[PDB]
DNA sequence: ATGTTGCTTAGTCC
DNA sequence: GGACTAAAGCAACA
């Protein structure tokens, strides 16, 4: 199918009980936010449709893109990686508004499940789930030559995509693995709150995830 | 009030 | 694998 029909039929999903209570859930539930629109719906990719690298993240945040309708927009996370893509050459502009006109070049955003999960933990049967999306999505991205995955869920997700074994493949930020057709497997830290804030990751190390992953996409 | 909540990782154990 | 938990720094939240 065509990216058209992707997103119609994505949007239309509710193969996880759970997750589509909780998307509706939490609307409501953070003071900054009560009174305003939430998406509360399953969260299409964002970026390049030309892509030569793709950030894989972990899903969905609360008040994030369950919020906003857009990849790591309105939370910590985008905070953190929007400003970051654009220092790399990346976007068009540093920040990204639902509805502005916001372009990345080179570069497409998803994740391993598209509904927000409580306690940010999607089960292992909702992975599977929504796993069949990442099939269609990755599908539609043609050019890409680097998976990045942001995070040890993100990683395991792209490992089970690739049909790679987990023993051979640990997941260690700044680890590096080939993929067939001279394509590569990135891995790195969750862009999180609680990966930044903390010094787990930090700007310049993200940076450098991105500078890396330029250069393996011959960018 | 100032204590609680919410935002992954790494190690443990079966 | 999968379930469980102590740990990390910050600030909205109550
Ligand atoms: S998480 Fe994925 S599979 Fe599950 S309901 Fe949402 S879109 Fe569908
Ligand atoms: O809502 P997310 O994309 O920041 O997880
Ligand atoms: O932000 P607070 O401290 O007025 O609740």
Redesign the pocket.
């Known amino acids: 199918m065509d990216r058209e029909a992707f997103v119609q039929t994505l949007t239309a999903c509710r193969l996880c009980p759970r997750l589509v209570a909780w998307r509706e859930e939490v609307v409501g539930r953070?003071?900054?936010?009560r009174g305003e629109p939430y998406w509360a719906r399953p969260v299409p990719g964002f970026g390049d449709p030309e892509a030569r690298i793709l950030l894989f993240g972990?899903a969905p945040?609360?008040?994030g893109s369950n919020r906003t309708g857009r990849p790591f927009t309105g939370?910590?996370?985008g905070a953190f990686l929007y400003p970051l893509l654009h220092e790399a050459g990346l976007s068009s502009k540093p920040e990204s508004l639902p509805g502005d006109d916001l372009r990345l070049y080179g570069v497409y955003l998803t994740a391993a499940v598209r509904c927000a999960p409580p306690?940010?933990?999607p089960?292992?049967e909702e992975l599977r789930a929504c796993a069949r999306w990442t099939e269609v999505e990755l599908g539609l991205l043609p050019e890409v030559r680097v998976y990045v995955a942001?995070?040890?869920?993100a990683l395991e997700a792209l490992l089970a995509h690739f049909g790679l074994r987990?023993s051979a493949h640990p997941?260690?930020?700044g680890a590096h693995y080939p993929l067939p057709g001279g394509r590569h497997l990135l891995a790195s830290?969750?862009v999180?709150?609680?990966?930044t804030?903390?010094?787990?990751?930090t700007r310049e190390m993200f940076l450098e995830v991105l500078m890396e992953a330029k250069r393996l996409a011959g960018l």
């Open positions: 953070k003071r900054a936010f972990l945040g609360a008040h939370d910590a996370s306690k940010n933990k089960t292992p942001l995070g040890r869920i987990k997941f260690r930020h830290y969750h999180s709150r609680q990966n804030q903390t010094g787990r990751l």
